[PDB]
Amino acid sequence: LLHIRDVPPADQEKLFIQKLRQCCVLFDFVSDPLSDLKWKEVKRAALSEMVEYITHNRNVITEPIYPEVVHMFAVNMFRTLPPSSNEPTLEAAWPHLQLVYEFFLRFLESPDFQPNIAKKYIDQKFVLQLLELFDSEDPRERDFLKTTLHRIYGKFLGLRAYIRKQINNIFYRFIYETEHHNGIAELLEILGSIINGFALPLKEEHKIFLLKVLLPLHKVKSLSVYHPQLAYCVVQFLEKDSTLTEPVVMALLKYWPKTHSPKEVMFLNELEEILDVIEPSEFVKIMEPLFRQLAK
Amino acid sequence: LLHIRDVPPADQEKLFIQKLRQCCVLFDFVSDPLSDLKWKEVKRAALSEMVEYITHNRNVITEPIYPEVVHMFAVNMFRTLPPSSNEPTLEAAWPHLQLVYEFFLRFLESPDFQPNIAKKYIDQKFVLQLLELFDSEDPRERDFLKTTLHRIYGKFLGLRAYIRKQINNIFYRFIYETEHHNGIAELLEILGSIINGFALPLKEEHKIFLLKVLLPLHKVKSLSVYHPQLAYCVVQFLEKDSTLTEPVVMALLKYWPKTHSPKEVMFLNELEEILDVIEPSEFVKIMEPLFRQLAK
Amino acid sequence: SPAKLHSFTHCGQAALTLHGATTTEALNILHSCHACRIRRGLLPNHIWQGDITHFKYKNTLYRLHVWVDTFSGSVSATHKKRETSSEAISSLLHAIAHLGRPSHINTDNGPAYASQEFQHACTSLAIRHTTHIPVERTNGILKTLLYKYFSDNPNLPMDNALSVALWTINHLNVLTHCQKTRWQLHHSPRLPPIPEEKPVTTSKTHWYYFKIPGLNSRQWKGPQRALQEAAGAALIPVSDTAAQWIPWKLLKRAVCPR
Amino acid sequence: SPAKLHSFTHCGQAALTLHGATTTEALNILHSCHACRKNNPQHQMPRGHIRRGLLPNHIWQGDITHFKYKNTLYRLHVWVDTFSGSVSATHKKRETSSEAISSLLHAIAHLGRPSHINTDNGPAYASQEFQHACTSLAIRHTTHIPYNPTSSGLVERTNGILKTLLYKYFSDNPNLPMDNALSVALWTINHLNVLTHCQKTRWQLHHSPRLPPIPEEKPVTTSKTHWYYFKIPGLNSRQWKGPQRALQEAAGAALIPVSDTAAQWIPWKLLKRAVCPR
Amino acid sequence: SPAKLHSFTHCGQAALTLHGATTTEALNILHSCHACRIRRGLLPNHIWQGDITHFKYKNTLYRLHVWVDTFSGSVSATHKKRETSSEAISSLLHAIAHLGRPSHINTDNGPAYASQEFQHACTSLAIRHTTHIPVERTNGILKTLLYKYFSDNPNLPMDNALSVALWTINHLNVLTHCQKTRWQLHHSPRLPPIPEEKPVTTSKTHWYYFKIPGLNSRQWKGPQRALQEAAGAALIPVSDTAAQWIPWKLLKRAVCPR
Amino acid sequence: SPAKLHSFTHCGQAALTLHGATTTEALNILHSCHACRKNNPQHQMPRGHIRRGLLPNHIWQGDITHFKYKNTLYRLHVWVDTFSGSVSATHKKRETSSEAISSLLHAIAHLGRPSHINTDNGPAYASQEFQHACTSLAIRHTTHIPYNPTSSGLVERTNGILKTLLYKYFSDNPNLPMDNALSVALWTINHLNVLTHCQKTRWQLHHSPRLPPIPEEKPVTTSKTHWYYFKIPGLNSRQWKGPQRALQEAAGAALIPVSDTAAQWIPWKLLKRAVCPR
DNA sequence: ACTGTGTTTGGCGCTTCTCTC
DNA sequence: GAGAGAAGCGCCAAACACA
DNA sequence: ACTGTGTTTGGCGCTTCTCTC
DNA sequence: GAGAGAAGCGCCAAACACA
Ligand SMILES: O=C(NCc1c(F)cc(F)cc1F)c1cn2c(c(O)c1=O)C(=O)N1[C@H]3CC[C@H](C3)O[C@@H]1C2
Ligand SMILES: O=C(NCc1c(F)cc(F)cc1F)c1cn2c(c(O)c1=O)C(=O)N1[C@H]3CC[C@H](C3)O[C@@H]1C2
Ligand SMILES: [Mg+2]
Ligand SMILES: [Mg+2]
Ligand SMILES: [Zn+2]
Ligand SMILES: [Zn+2]
Ligand SMILES: [Zn+2]
Ligand SMILES: [Zn+2]
């Protein structure tokens, strides 16, 4: 078409929408490496021009712009996942996906964005379809997804408890129904960032959360791939209230592997961190059982 | 009493008036050189304090201040003249008179002075009594009187034609009735300064003035004591209109001394100045009679 | 040029993929070269590991003081001719300058790290030091890179090779798991906390009066919002089409017109 | 006549006004005077600003400074990132092309790989070895106007800050080794001290996300030239020279022909506006 | 001290009267000293008279180039060893610097003042020069003063004596007729013209913002009227009681509050 | 703790703030630091102004300047009236007390008799002959702070103006004699050129009526003293010295004891505020 | 007492002018 | 006949050099 | 291309504190 | 019970030195 900055402002938003519509068409690298090369080049150039334009002007976002860009995002990212294959493979269409992720990130964090316009454009279904994408094997996709989900959770207020219920449900499914998952670490980092912003006094459903989906989660045989982040979550929560540390102690004293295995050391690490905080406030109620358990 | 600057502003003008009243008493040096020495010292110090105070503050002159200071001036300066005695003698009370003259000069030229308040405080009688003082033999007194009369004439508008009539009358008396006068030079300087500010076209009474009191005035035997200033007056007037130079030519060709005398040279000087201006505009109407007259 | 970059740098094939070359060309270059043919810490700069390694040369020995971050694998190496406590402190300070001040440090026992001088140095920096007696992989890859560089050319001052090796390990090579370089993973900003029951308001930057450089004007033209700010300059869109970096000396703080 | 009076005494503007002249005519006489403009050291020309990079690791700036400590004169090679102000400094014994190359490589290992770097016309920046090292990493090394230290203000100011911190450290413990003091000062500058205006440390700006793209630039300059009185930057002279006509002028300096053989580049600080001969 | 002033200066008795001494003391001092016991021009700097005088010494001769104003008697004297046209031009320029540029000049004929160089010098200054062939009193009093100074002490460089004599003639001695010194009469401001049918309005000076020196404040305190102005300072009454000289660097122009 | 961090690294204010400290506490740490204040060359002290006379011929200011012309180095003795700016200059061959006395007498003959005169501590102003000449006319000759040319700004600026006019004159006619050029320049400065601010020439102000009296002055000064970091005016040093307590301070300078034997006078430009030891 | 200051200069707001639809 | 360009003119803050 | 810049510092307006009639 | 002093804190223009 034409460059977005070489048009008069009267119809500048019109060409904005039209060029947004240009990238709505799909391009699959998995089907064959060489297919519509110049179309793909035009799409990449258009995406670069859009992402450079969005971050250099003010009063750009307007009422009829909020749907379609998300729809464009909805066209490209939300799709059937590639078949599982257990160095992990890299997604074939990474360039276009990376540009789209960057453009969406800039679209959401722009100072002109109003959190009261997308309330009837972004709903629970969007969050479900986005969270189902966290199963992706690509680590770069996981990084961009987590850094986008953090902003989405922070900006909106009516979409918080629903995400909490959804993460509880997916944790229950992961720990009970299906053990195949690859995005434990990123979600744990987001959860830790959420935990850091709690206030006093701590509410009861936080206690239920930690007792149900945090402490039992240690039983997973694949803990080593996400050992630090999960631990940090615990090291992030207990500082709000030190009275609730004892149930964590009985949980870690029961989930400890009673047989010799290389997995022991990681447990010690978490205990060490807990120890480094458990010494003050005269916490010796469960010191003797803990010492007896670690003696064996 | 007390220093004028060491009193609160509520009654500062009261002490201003009171200290002005202190110098109203007379002190005569002619009667005897040593009389009331400390009173005279206090009077001199008070006059110095008043003249330094008047020129360092604003919004000082007020409605009940305009009369009395002039009255104080009226008490000291307007008086019977010392007897005539024909190096001229110096007036005995010069210090006090000099301070009073300086104080009056500063009083009249202060930016706070309003020329509409003294209109019914300064009248024709004041100007007569001031002009009668120009007969004083003291040259410093004549200088201060002329530099005061210039300001008085310039500031007021309704006292101009009256002064012109008075100077015409005193010139008539000096040239016809009494030949004893000592303030010709200063008055001529003031008149020349007045002449410099005329406009076009020149009015008829200016022509009458020059024909009656200026040109015949050359017949005075004591011209040499005021030769330059008078000449300057002529050299100041004719530039406004060069058509009126010819009657001046016939006047100077008739008042020329027909007999040999040292007085000739001064006449030549004036003619030289007139010559230096009479050459342009093709002024040769009276060139031949003038050459014939100067040939003898 | 990926070919010359690999000739000088001898970095991994993935690093070549991030450049202009693609997977096939990166593999072809990698296999055509004659020479090339868990985590304990929770956060960056939280727990370190300090090793001392002996570098063998044809006619001399070198001492490599290496500090490795346990969360990202960042390496800080210093070359010395001897080994005392003073040089241990110097290497620690250099590592702090390159990376930052860690909260916890860990190293093996020996003549160094056990004297009063090292404990005094760690005390002033509020660094708690623990000793254990029995990573070793970063050391090995560092030695291999140094050997490759010396094989490429023997006329090196032993300083340029070390500096290049550190640059390659930290900035050029990319980790296989997280697909991030060690510098990128170590210095990636963390996720800010999310306050509860309070919306995360967008940060608003102040407005500025600006003057166009190179015009010698004495007028400040309009209070306007700044897109980005940097050291010695700030982005100001002079019109509705373009933006320019204006120095701080030509910018004045303002208030929102409301 | 004002013309002859000014040609004789070279008086001011109001001095010509009181003798009879309009303000514009007297002003025209003043600006048309040839001797009255070369002898007046007062001028008013636009100010220059050093070129700044569009993103981290775009443009660097380097210099060499001397430091006296324990009767030894150490040479500090200082490199500063133009975008963020990050400083990498290495202390050496002498000045040599090998020392400059080693310092540059250490700066690369500490901060990153820059595209363009500019320094003054030092004795060690113009050697063959330094140019070969720069072109081996595809780094464009440029030069400044000779004997014009103002064009490298950022790096000289950074040298002053570093020296001040070193003197502060040596005032307390005179027995502190040089390397310890330099490392502590570098850590304090990069990670602890915050910039005055943006209130962000150099370290946050250097490792801020590179997501913002590089704004497009326009190389279009002025198509006109003027007449300038010029002074040679190397040697200071009491009076201006010329006037001459600039072959071409850019932002911050102008190409002034010093003689009939070769031209030169003169900054805007040593140029004065002239009257049009035609 | 009038006594020491007369010892060094040998001025008139009236000049002593203008000082602390009075008439009786001035007469007593004057008669106790062993050594002391018309106008053509119309305005100052209108017509001058230029004379060249020979000063006789015990072993040499001096040339005194003297320019005398015909309206006030102001004297400008320059000492030379020879007499040519160039030194005549130099003496004229020095007289212009001391007094100003006259409109008309007059001098006697001779080797000087008649060459093309002197006419060229007078033409550029717009000075018309006339020559007559036959004041002489100022010359005589100058010679008498120089003789008295040399009698007081013979060890003078012939320059200090001349400078002192000029100072005494122009600034210290007072004329008998007008009771004014030659400098005072020459440089007395003339009476401004009086426009007709228009009142002579009082000149109004601008207002100023001022800062008190020695306080390092950054506030300008009130627009206020200036009593007097000078070179590098101006009178500002800081309160309703006192006034202070404020330098121009601490003053800013303002507008009347109305 | 901010205290140990600042005692180790000497960081800034916000660097202590982000580690936990109120703004006032960090500011107190910064101003209470001993090394952080002697090494910082930045200070903020009130400015000084030369003493100006209350009326014409009250205070004069003199200096000696060099001029190169026709391979000869003439010495111009310049005297300037402080009230009106009137200039009297005499050109001589060498510098000697006799030359200074002759120049002063010529200035008296040209302008008038001054009461107080102040110059720098030149080699010719401190001789017995000059003092005897000054006391013969009851003229009080004072001196300035040594090696502080700023205290004589008016006369040095007048020297610059006079030299600029001389160079303008010599640019047109190189064969013009020195005395002619000096006389023309003096006439132009005194009688033709108008002052920038008051828009009145020096000559009108000098011979303006002396009718305005001399305002009364108050010699009352501050009765308190403070602690100051000081630098010797003669030799420039990188860091401040002291701190010490001033014996007495006046407007524009202060009496600072350099050592335990004798004190000295230090201008406000080389003084820095200190913290109270008690 | 002790102590930095006066001139030059393009850009710009305010004001008074005249060629053009 | 009328309102927008064009010449006139008073003012000022950043620069420079006085060894 | 070519081109001066970042930190220190007392004074001051705006704001939030508490001892006193 | 309430309103004037007192401690806190963000901001800035003139200075300084980098050979
Ligand atoms: O530095 C001087 N001028 C430049 C300047 C300025 F003018 C004004 C400023 F604000 C700053 C400046 F840098 C300067 C130096 N000296 C003398 C001067 O009069 C003088 O002006 C002087 O007479 N002596 C004698 C007493 C001991 C010997 C002889 O050295 C000093 C040197
Ligand atoms: O004058 C200098 N600094 C002081 C200063 C400033 F920092 C900033 C300013 F705005 C003004 C200043 F007066 C300075 C001088 N030189 C060099 C510098 O880098 C340098 O900063 C440099 O490298 N060379 C080499 C190239 C030829 C040889 C060697 O001499 C020059 C000397
Ligand atoms: Mg430098
Ligand atoms: Mg000097
Ligand atoms: Zn290889
Ligand atoms: Zn000229
Ligand atoms: Zn005598
Ligand atoms: Zn400190």
mmCIF file of N, CA and C in Angstrom, chain D residues 88-121:
data_model
loop_
_atom_site.group_PDB
_atom_site.id
_atom_site.type_symbol
_atom_site.label_atom_id
_atom_site.label_comp_id
_atom_site.label_asym_id
_atom_site.label_seq_id
_atom_site.Cartn_x
_atom_site.Cartn_y
_atom_site.Cartn_z
ATOM 1 N N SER D 88 33.865 2.602 30.969
ATOM 2 C CA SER D 88 34.837 1.524 31.097
ATOM 3 C C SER D 88 36.227 2.141 31.058
ATOM 4 N N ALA D 89 36.993 1.950 32.129
ATOM 5 C CA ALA D 89 38.304 2.568 32.262
ATOM 6 C C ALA D 89 39.344 1.516 32.607
ATOM 7 N N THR D 90 40.500 1.603 31.951
ATOM 8 C CA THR D 90 41.624 0.712 32.216
ATOM 9 C C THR D 90 42.865 1.547 32.489
ATOM 10 N N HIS D 91 43.634 1.159 33.502
ATOM 11 C CA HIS D 91 44.840 1.879 33.887
ATOM 12 C C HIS D 91 46.060 1.151 33.334
ATOM 13 N N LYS D 92 46.955 1.899 32.696
ATOM 14 C CA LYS D 92 48.161 1.362 32.086
ATOM 15 C C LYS D 92 49.366 2.203 32.488
ATOM 16 N N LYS D 93 50.550 1.701 32.133
ATOM 17 C CA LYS D 93 51.804 2.360 32.472
ATOM 18 C C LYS D 93 52.213 3.408 31.443
ATOM 19 N N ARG D 94 52.022 3.124 30.156
ATOM 20 C CA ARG D 94 52.454 4.018 29.091
ATOM 21 C C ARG D 94 51.363 4.100 28.034
ATOM 22 N N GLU D 95 51.578 4.973 27.052
ATOM 23 C CA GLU D 95 50.648 5.179 25.948
ATOM 24 C C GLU D 95 51.228 4.542 24.693
ATOM 25 N N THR D 96 50.516 3.559 24.148
ATOM 26 C CA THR D 96 50.961 2.845 22.959
ATOM 27 C C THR D 96 49.723 2.289 22.268
ATOM 28 N N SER D 97 49.849 2.040 20.961
ATOM 29 C CA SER D 97 48.731 1.495 20.196
ATOM 30 C C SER D 97 48.259 0.167 20.772
ATOM 31 N N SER D 98 49.191 -0.649 21.273
ATOM 32 C CA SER D 98 48.807 -1.900 21.918
ATOM 33 C C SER D 98 47.962 -1.641 23.159
ATOM 34 N N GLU D 99 48.330 -0.628 23.948
ATOM 35 C CA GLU D 99 47.540 -0.281 25.125
ATOM 36 C C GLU D 99 46.138 0.166 24.734
ATOM 37 N N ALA D 100 46.026 0.975 23.678
ATOM 38 C CA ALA D 100 44.713 1.422 23.223
ATOM 39 C C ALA D 100 43.865 0.251 22.743
ATOM 40 N N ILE D 101 44.469 -0.679 22.000
ATOM 41 C CA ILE D 101 43.727 -1.840 21.514
ATOM 42 C C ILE D 101 43.260 -2.704 22.680
ATOM 43 N N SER D 102 44.138 -2.934 23.661
ATOM 44 C CA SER D 102 43.757 -3.727 24.825
ATOM 45 C C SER D 102 42.646 -3.049 25.618
ATOM 46 N N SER D 103 42.730 -1.727 25.782
ATOM 47 C CA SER D 103 41.681 -0.999 26.490
ATOM 48 C C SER D 103 40.354 -1.091 25.751
ATOM 49 N N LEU D 104 40.384 -0.973 24.421
ATOM 50 C CA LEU D 104 39.156 -1.093 23.641
ATOM 51 C C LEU D 104 38.555 -2.486 23.769
ATOM 52 N N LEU D 105 39.393 -3.525 23.732
ATOM 53 C CA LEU D 105 38.883 -4.886 23.876
ATOM 54 C C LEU D 105 38.295 -5.114 25.265
ATOM 55 N N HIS D 106 38.936 -4.567 26.301
ATOM 56 C CA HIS D 106 38.374 -4.659 27.646
ATOM 57 C C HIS D 106 37.035 -3.938 27.731
ATOM 58 N N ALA D 107 36.927 -2.774 27.088
ATOM 59 C CA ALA D 107 35.660 -2.051 27.068
ATOM 60 C C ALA D 107 34.580 -2.853 26.352
ATOM 61 N N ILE D 108 34.944 -3.534 25.263
ATOM 62 C CA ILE D 108 33.986 -4.391 24.567
ATOM 63 C C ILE D 108 33.529 -5.526 25.474
ATOM 64 N N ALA D 109 34.471 -6.159 26.177
ATOM 65 C CA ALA D 109 34.118 -7.242 27.086
ATOM 66 C C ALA D 109 33.277 -6.764 28.262
ATOM 67 N N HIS D 110 33.400 -5.494 28.645
ATOM 68 C CA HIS D 110 32.670 -4.972 29.795
ATOM 69 C C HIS D 110 31.290 -4.436 29.429
ATOM 70 N N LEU D 111 31.149 -3.816 28.262
ATOM 71 C CA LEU D 111 29.900 -3.169 27.876
ATOM 72 C C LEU D 111 29.238 -3.794 26.660
ATOM 73 N N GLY D 112 29.958 -3.938 25.560
ATOM 74 C CA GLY D 112 29.399 -4.483 24.341
ATOM 75 C C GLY D 112 30.198 -4.015 23.141
ATOM 76 N N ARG D 113 29.676 -4.318 21.954
ATOM 77 C CA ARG D 113 30.363 -3.986 20.717
ATOM 78 C C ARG D 113 29.752 -2.745 20.090
ATOM 79 N N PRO D 114 30.493 -1.643 20.005
ATOM 80 C CA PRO D 114 29.964 -0.430 19.381
ATOM 81 C C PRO D 114 30.160 -0.418 17.874
ATOM 82 N N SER D 115 29.320 0.372 17.208
ATOM 83 C CA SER D 115 29.389 0.515 15.758
ATOM 84 C C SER D 115 30.320 1.657 15.356
ATOM 85 N N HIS D 116 30.079 2.852 15.887
ATOM 86 C CA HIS D 116 30.901 4.020 15.614
ATOM 87 C C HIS D 116 31.562 4.498 16.898
ATOM 88 N N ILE D 117 32.833 4.878 16.799
ATOM 89 C CA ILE D 117 33.572 5.459 17.913
ATOM 90 C C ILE D 117 34.317 6.684 17.402
ATOM 91 N N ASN D 118 34.344 7.741 18.211
ATOM 92 C CA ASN D 118 35.051 8.964 17.857
ATOM 93 C C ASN D 118 35.927 9.402 19.021
ATOM 94 N N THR D 119 37.176 9.740 18.716
ATOM 95 C CA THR D 119 38.113 10.301 19.677
ATOM 96 C C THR D 119 38.811 11.492 19.034
ATOM 97 N N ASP D 120 39.672 12.149 19.806
ATOM 98 C CA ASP D 120 40.454 13.244 19.255
ATOM 99 C C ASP D 120 41.571 12.688 18.368
ATOM 100 N N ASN D 121 42.407 13.586 17.850
ATOM 101 C CA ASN D 121 43.520 13.192 16.986
ATOM 102 C C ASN D 121 44.779 12.927 17.813
#
